[PDB]
Amino acid sequence: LWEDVQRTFETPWCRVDVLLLQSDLANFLRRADELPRAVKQFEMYKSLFSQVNMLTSVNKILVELKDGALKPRHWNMIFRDIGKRQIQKNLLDKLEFSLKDVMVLNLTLNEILLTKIIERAQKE
Amino acid sequence: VTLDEKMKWLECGLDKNDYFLENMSIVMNSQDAVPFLLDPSSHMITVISNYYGNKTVLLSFLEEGFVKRLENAIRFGSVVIIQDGEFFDPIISRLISREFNHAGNRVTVEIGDHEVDVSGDFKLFIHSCDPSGDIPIFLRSRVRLVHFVTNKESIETRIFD
Amino acid sequence: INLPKLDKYGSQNVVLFLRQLMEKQGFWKTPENKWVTIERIHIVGACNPPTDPGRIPMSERFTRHAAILYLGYPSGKSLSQIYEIYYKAIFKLVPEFRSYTEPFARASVHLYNECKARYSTGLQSHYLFSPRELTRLVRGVYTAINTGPRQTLRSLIRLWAYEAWRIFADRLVGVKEKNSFEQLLYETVDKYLPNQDLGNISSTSLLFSGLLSLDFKEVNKTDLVNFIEERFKTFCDEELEVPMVIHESMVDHILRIDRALKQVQGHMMLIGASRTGKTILTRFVAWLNGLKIVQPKIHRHSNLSDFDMILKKAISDCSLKESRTCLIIDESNILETAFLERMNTLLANADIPDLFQGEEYDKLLNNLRNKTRSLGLLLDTEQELYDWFVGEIAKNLHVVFTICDPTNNKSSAMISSPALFNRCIINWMGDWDTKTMSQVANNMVDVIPMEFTDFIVPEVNKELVFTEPIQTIRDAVVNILIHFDRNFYQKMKVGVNPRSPGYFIDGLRALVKLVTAKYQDLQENQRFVNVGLEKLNES
Amino acid sequence: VLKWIPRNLPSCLINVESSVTSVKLHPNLPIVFVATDHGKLYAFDLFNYTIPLASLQSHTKAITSMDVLFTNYTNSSKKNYLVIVTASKDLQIHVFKWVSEECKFQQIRSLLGHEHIVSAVKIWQKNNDVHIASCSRDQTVKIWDFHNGWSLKTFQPHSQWVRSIDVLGDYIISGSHDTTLRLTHWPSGNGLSVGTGHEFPIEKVKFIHFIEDSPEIRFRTPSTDRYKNWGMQYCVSASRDRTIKIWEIPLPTLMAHRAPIPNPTDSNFRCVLTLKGHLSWVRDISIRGQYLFSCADDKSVRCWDLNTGQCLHVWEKLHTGFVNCLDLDVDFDSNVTPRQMMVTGGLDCKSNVFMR
Ligand SMILES: Nc1ncnc2c1ncn2[C@@H]1O[C@H](COP(=O)(O)OP(=O)(O)O)[C@@H](O)[C@H]1O
């Protein structure tokens, strides 16, 4: 499961579909309960379970971030202002940055900034 | 107001008569709502421009740069006179009603999609052609109507003079 | 079938095509010029009676081939039965009053019949009643019972009367018709309900609101007025800043707009006159209920596409984000019949089938799939998703129409529109009465330079005082202002309701400013002469 | 001791010229300070409340909030006194000093840094140093310094105008007009968590401070982990949606010599209890021992129980108008002993007191 979690996270942003992602996290949540209590008491399971909660709870902001109005310039602005880091130009212009890089952005904490940026994205 | 205002009005190009003097008194006295200057003759816009000098900005509803030149003029107190009052666009509707959202250091008005400041000395005037055309009830209500049409139904005053 | 218009020389080509189909059993293919014979295809038409506006009498050469069936409104006794079932279903909630389920239905039907008989289209274009009004009354009674406290029989009767006032008598104009409705309601209660415990039944003494508490119950007038005052101060401080005087009529209009915006699918048109408060009241009431205001903005002549995208954004916010929008459609926001068609088809079922088509339809269905999955309400077929979409739009989008003097051609056209008429709570607020003008002026003349002018209180005949009896200058000045307003409106213009008082408020504001300035000048003159006299005394 | 339900009738009623906006008790003397909607700050003695001891018109506009801190300098060079910091709608934050030996107000500073109306003000002392916080409608929370008067830090926690604020150590929680809470480390201006779930603007926000003399209590005591080291576990926030919600603050990844970093693993508040029963907007909140006292616009005051979550007593029709403020002496602090009084300044130009 943990390998499945990591491979889902490393998936590039251009190849993830919001409905597909939601179904995949539903499958992950279903598979999580089948683990024994001994696995439950060990910390990596708790960490990945919290990651699954992240992906289930940030569904709305992920959907709003998957709208076609957003552009590579807009993602550059998001990563420079909210992430405080710049992605390489070749990887940025292809919108293939890993979903882990989006999770690095707190999303829940910076949801208002994301919403205003996507509002400007729609208005363009 | 005193006779200084009377001679200032007359020297700008107004007629020497009770009707036009009273209408100018109505237009000038207090500005809590925009005035609607209505007269078939176009000589009154020249009078308004002469009163305020070269700071007057001329603008019309029909031309394209309408909103941009509004956002320019209003923020640093340029008196604006609208050429046509018969037509109207409800974009400027926010400005007509005193709906500025005050703050501790500024007052702002919403035009289109821009929160543009207003200097506070800004004056807005509306000029109209012959009263044959109609005006929407919004304009007729909010805006202070005033007739500068050539004398009619009175005649006795001019011949009396 | 009678809707299509005639040609220059009469006759409708579509109706003649239908006559060809019914009589000759076929038609001519226009580009191939060949005769086609239709087999076992039936033609069924549905039309309103020709006396309705917009209906054109068809040629008898067409109606000669069809059996005309008149499916009128159901009887005057079938309604009694149907609403006896409806009231039984309602009173399942309160079985202690099960014995009164029949008199309530009888009184409702008698109310409907009397309203139909008294107020007719010959007086106002918008006096048109149907069993839809009775269904609305039943549903309103159910909503107030369901979200209310433990009802008592007097409370039940008063609630039913309040619902009757909101469904039927809101559309009435003037005061004579409202008094007629009040006496009719008294007569109905006396005739069909032997219980006699109601107090005053008028619209100003039936105040039901879920604002002051968690239950839809009757509220005290003074408590509600104070609550509205302290909420409206906050509204002005936070939202738009225009100072507005609180008066009794505005409280009733606030209650009406509140109960309309709380409906499952509730739209209202405020057909009054300009500078009354129709828009600001809607904004305030939506602010109380937490609805997002969307006011469409157009230029001199905006194409239909701009209105379409405004509607699409509002619909998306209502459904995919449960924003609970309160769309305010002013008359100036409508300038072509396409806008009216879009509004009436939006109010028709719940929404616009047209705004979602093609790629946008695919994106909308994907978003609906993901949203329904997020709420854990998975639906595997397109029909279920579209039904959920329609339900969300119905229970989240409230459209309010702000209409000035209905004598305008566009106002009359949109009032007379069938869909908007039937699907909206028509609320005639009209122009300010003497009491409302008196209250507004009294709260606007509250300035201290109103004093210092010795007032010779006159005998002043009570028949021409309007406001409270005169004991101070404030009464004199308010009476003078209101009397001049009435004289000016009855002299300059001829007609009924040309425009609500907008000159009155400007006159009061200018009066206050001028009095303050002139008295400041007088005070400084008094100070100058007094100090000069004091210095001369010192000399 | 802490468990004290005030009598169903107020002990003494204080009449003021206009509506009361914020009432603050005196930490040592029995003096009630009352602010008004006309900016006139009033000081009232509890035993002699007929005439105010001293009234001072500092702000032209209405006072929006008041906070009171008794200085506790550890050096004998300076003498302890009282600091009264008042916000107002005139973009001013006036700081006074209560001259106990003369019973008069001595203004010290006239802080002004906000670009629009300031709503709430909180003042606290940290190792001979006194700091003043102030959230305003310009969406900015400014951390002032009392001795100097220069804003140590300014940050924007919300895109809509912040209304309430509460400090505890180096962290600020601020409820805003956009119906969200946000815990912010004010020395660095770094956000840590966001609390969503209210459907109307948030009126008042308070931390639930840790208490230990009580045997056991649902919320005031920590939940083991490193929350005890952290110092805070829960927070309570009234809102215009006529409900009071008690949240649990997610615990960030603290690091030595580094400002706390918002934990991506958990960065959302989690509602644990939702008190319902008020008939209108809840205006103010105070916590004493186990009982959560709240005042609302329904002209009533309620005393919820933190453990069960149920209302115990209701002071219905306490005021003829709304109830704008409610004050109780803090009990987590050491120098300030909990003293059994309760004051409810209202909109009816009156300020009930619940002495015993
Ligand atoms: N009760 C009131 N007290 C004071 N002014 C009012 C009142 N009702 C309406 N007004 C005036 O009406 C204007 C707002 O009316 P509004 O509702 O926006 O126009 P409309 O009725 O055409 O939508 C304000 O300028 C205000 O001065």
**D327-356 b/e (C-beta count within 10 Å ≥ 16 → b):** bbbebeeeebebeebbbbbbbbbbbbbbbe
Note whether B91 contacts C297, CB cutoff 8 Å: yes
- A111 inside 8 A of chain D by CB: yes
How many other C-beta atoms lie within 10 A of the C-beta of residue D298? Answer: 26
| Tokens 């959920």 belong to residue | C388
**Among A102, A89, A111, A117, which Cα is nearest to A11's?**
A102
> What b/e string do you get for A50-77 counting C-beta neighbours within 10 Å, with b at 16 or more?
ebbebbeebbbbbbbbeeeebeeebbeb
Which residues precede gaps in chain D, with C-N > 2.5 A?
none
* Secondary structure (3-state) at A118: helix
Q: Is B60 on the interface with C (CB under 8 A)?
A: no
The per-residue DSSP string of C323-364 comes to: --EEEEEESTT--SHHHHHHHHHHHHSSS-SSSS-THHHHHH
Nearest-CA residue of chain C relative to B33? C506
Q: Residues of C within the annotated binding site for ATP?
A: 272-279
Q: How far is the CA of D76 from the centre of ligand 1 (A)?
A: 63
Q: Could you give the CA distance from residue C487 to residue C489 in angstroms, rounded to a whole number? A: 6
D178–A108: do the CB atoms touch at under 8 Å?
no
Residue of C213, C230, C290 with shortest CB distance to D347:
C230
Joined tokens for residue D44: 């009232």
- Check B90 against C405: CB less than 8 A apart: no
Instruction: Report the first-to-last Cα separation within chain A, whole angstroms.
Output: 41
Helix axes A111-123, A72-81, angle to 10 degrees: 160
**Minimal Cα–Cα distance from D137 to chain B, Å?**
9
Can you give the resolution of this entry in Å? Answer: 3.3
Nearest alpha carbon to residue C107 among C51, C147, C164, C150 = C164
Distance, CA of D21 to CA of D351 (rounded, Å): 10
User: CB-based contact (8 Å) between C297 and chain B?
Assistant: yes
Rounded to 10°, the helix B43-52/B3-12 angle is 130
Element (H, E) at D23: strand D20-25
Would you state the structure tokens that stand for residue B131, as one six-digit string? Answer: 């009263």
What residue in C sits closest to B31 (Cα-Cα)? C510
Element (H, E) at C442: helix C434-444
Q: Do C373 and A19 touch (CB under 8 A)?
A: yes
Question: φ and ψ at C177, to 5 degrees?
Answer: -70, -35
Tell me the backbone φ, ψ of residue C283, rounded to 5 degrees. Answer: -60, -45
Tell me the Ramachandran region of residue C11: left when phi exceeds 0, alpha when psi lies from -120 to 50, beta otherwise: left
What single DSSP character describes residue C169?
I
φ, ψ for residue C121, nearest 5 deg = -65, -20
| CA angle centred on C314, ends C312 and C318, rounded to 5° | 115
Task: Name the strand (E) or helix (H) holding C63.
Answer: helix C60-63
Q: In what order do the strands lie in the sheet with B35-38?
A: B57-59, B80-82, B124-128, B35-38, B144-147
Name every residue whose Cβ is closer than 8 Å to that of residue A102 and which is 6 or more positions away in sequence: A13, A62, A65
C301/B112 Cα distance (integer angstroms): 15
CA dist., res. B2 & res. B21, Å (int): 13
Beta bridge partners of D245: D237, D274
Residue D202 identity: I
State whether residue B61 is helix, strand or coil.
coil
β pairing state of D141-145 and D153-155: antiparallel
Instruction: Strand D12-15: give its sheet, edge to edge.
Output: D12-15, D350-353, D342-345, D327-328
List strands edge to edge, sheet with D171-173: D166-168, D171-173, D180-185, D190-196
Type of residue numbered D191: G
Distance CA C432, CA C489 (A): 13
* Nearby residues of C187 by Cβ (< 8 Å), 6 or more positions away: none
Residue D322 has which token pair? Answer: 């709304």
**CB nearest D262 (choices: A54, A109, A112):** A109
What's the maximum distance between 2 C-alpha atoms anywhere in chain B? 56
Pairwise CA distance, residues D196 & C299, whole Å = 38
Instruction: Find the DSSP H helices in chain D.
Output: 227-230
Q: How far apart are the first and last CA of chain B?
A: 23
| CA C297 to ligand 1 centroid distance, Å | 20
CA neighbours closer than 13 Å in the CB half-sphere of residue C252: 16
Neighbours of D63 (CB within 10 A): 26
D258 bridge partner residues: D255
What amino acid is encoded at B71 in this protein? E
D90 touches chain C (CB under 8 A): no
Sheet holding D311-314, edge to edge: D282-288, D291-296, D301-305, D311-314
Tell me how far the alpha carbon of residue C405 lies from the centroid of ligand 1, in angstroms.
Answer: 15
Q: Which chains touch D (3 or more CB pairs under 8 A)?
A: A, B, C
Q: What is the largest CA-CA distance in chain A?
A: 53
Q: How was this structure determined?
A: cryo-EM
- Closest ligand 1 atom to residue C402 Cα is 23
Q: Looking at the complex, report in whole angstroms how far the Cα of residue C131 sits from the nearest Cα belonging to chain D.
A: 37
C239 touches chain D (CB under 8 A): no
Inter-residue contact B117 to B106 (CB < 8 Å)? yes
Distance CA C324, CA C322 (A): 6
3-state secondary structure of D72: coil
Q: Are A114 and A61 in contact (CB under 8 A)?
A: yes
Per-residue b/e over C267-284, b at no fewer than 16 CB within 10 Å? bbbbbbbbbbbbbbbbbb
Find, among C435, C433, C443, the residue nearest to C245 by Cα: C443
CA separation for the pair C103, C160 (Å, rounded): 12
CA gap C206, C204 in Å, rounded = 6
Residue of C251, C275, C411 best suited for mutating to test ligand 1, as the one with most atoms within 8 Å of CB: C275
Q: How far, in Å, CA of C186 to CA of C391, rounded?
A: 39
Cα C347 to averaged position of ligand 1 atoms, centre (Å): 28
Q: Specify the 3-state DSSP secondary structure of B41.
A: coil
Residue of C235, C293, C298, C299 to mutate when probing chain B, most B C-beta within 10 A: C299
Reduced to 3 states, what is the DSSP secondary structure of residue A12? Answer: strand
**DSSP 8-state symbol, D6:** P
| C516 neighbourhood in chain B, CB within 8 Å | none
Does residue D145 contact residue D160 with C-beta atoms inside 8 Å?
Answer: no
Which residues, including other chains, have CB under 8 Å from residue C101's CB and lie 6 or more apart? Answer: C84, C87, C88, C90, C91
In sign, the C-alpha dihedral spanning C50, C51, C52, C57 is positive
Residues in chain A: 124
- Single-letter amino acid, residue C244: M
Where do we find the tokens 């251009």? A14
For D224-281, the DSSP string reads STTHHHH---EEEEEETTSEEEEEEPPPPEEETTEEEEPPSS--B-EEEEEEE--SS-
Pairwise CA distance, residues D103 & D30, whole Å: 12
- CB pairs under 8 A, 24+ apart, for C116-121? C118/C180, C118/C184, C119/C172, C119/C177
Structure tokens at D88: 């107002």
Q: Which chain C residues contact residue D280 at CB under 8 A?
A: 212, 227
CA–centroid distance, C164 to ligand 1, in Å, is 28
| Ligand 1: residue whose CA is nearest its atom 1 | C245
Q: Which residues pair with D132 in a beta bridge?
A: D123, D144
Query: CB distance C240–B89 less than 8 Å?
Result: no
Give residues with Cβ within 8 angstroms of C480, minimum separation 6. none
How many residues can be counted in chain B? 161
- CA-CA distances (angstroms) from residue A72 to A114, C21, C131, D72? 14, 60, 58, 56
Helix axes C359-374, A18-33, angle to 10 degrees: 20
Q: Which residues pair with D301 in a beta bridge?
A: D295
Is there a contact between C317 and C323 (Cβ–Cβ < 8 Å)? Answer: yes
Beta strands in C196-320 (DSSP E): 208-209, 217-218, 267-272, 292-294
Inspect the interface and report whether the beta carbons of C212 and D321 lie closer than 8 Å. no
Contact D91, B104 (CB under 8 A): yes
Any idea which residue has 């002993």 for tokens? D337
The rounded distance, in Å, linking the Cα atoms of B136 and B128 is 13
Question: What values do phi and psi take at D86, rounded to 5?
Answer: -125, 130
Q: What is the largest CA-CA distance in chain D?
A: 57
Please give the Cα distance from C423 to C266 (Å, whole number). 8
- Written as one string, the DSSP assignment of D274-323 is EEE--SS-EEEEEEETTEEEEEESSS-EEEEETTT--EEEE-TTSSSS--
Dihedral angle at the C-alpha atoms of D193, D194, D195, D201, nearest 10 degrees?
Answer: 140
**Buried/exposed D167-197: b ≥16 CB within 10 Å, e otherwise:** bbeebbbbbbbbbbbbbbbbeebbbbbbbeb
DSSP string, C175-225: THHHHHHHHHHHHHHHHH---------STTS--EESSSSSS-EE--HHHHH
Q: Are B104 and D114 in contact (CB under 8 A)?
A: yes
CA nearest neighbour of C206 among C219, C215, C197, C194: C219
Matching residue, tokens 């122009």:
C431
DSSP state of D351: E
Q: Judging by beta carbons within 10 Å of its beta carbon (0-12, 13-18, 19+), is residue D249 exposed, middle or buried? A: buried
Q: Which of C150, C135, C159 is nearest to C95 (CA)?
A: C150
Pocket of ligand 1 (CB under 6 A): B 97; C 242, 244-245, 247, 250, 274-280, 402, 440, 505
Cα of B92 vs centre of ligand 1, distance in Å, is 18
Are the Cβ atoms of C226 and D321 closer than 8 angstroms? yes
The bridge status of strand D153-155 relative to strand D166-168 is: unpaired
Q: Are A72 and A95 in contact (CB under 8 A)?
A: yes
First to last CA, chain C: 101
Residue of B141, B146, B147 to mutate, testing the C interface (most C Cβ within 10 Å of its Cβ): B141
Cβ atoms of D117 and D163 closer than 8 Å: no
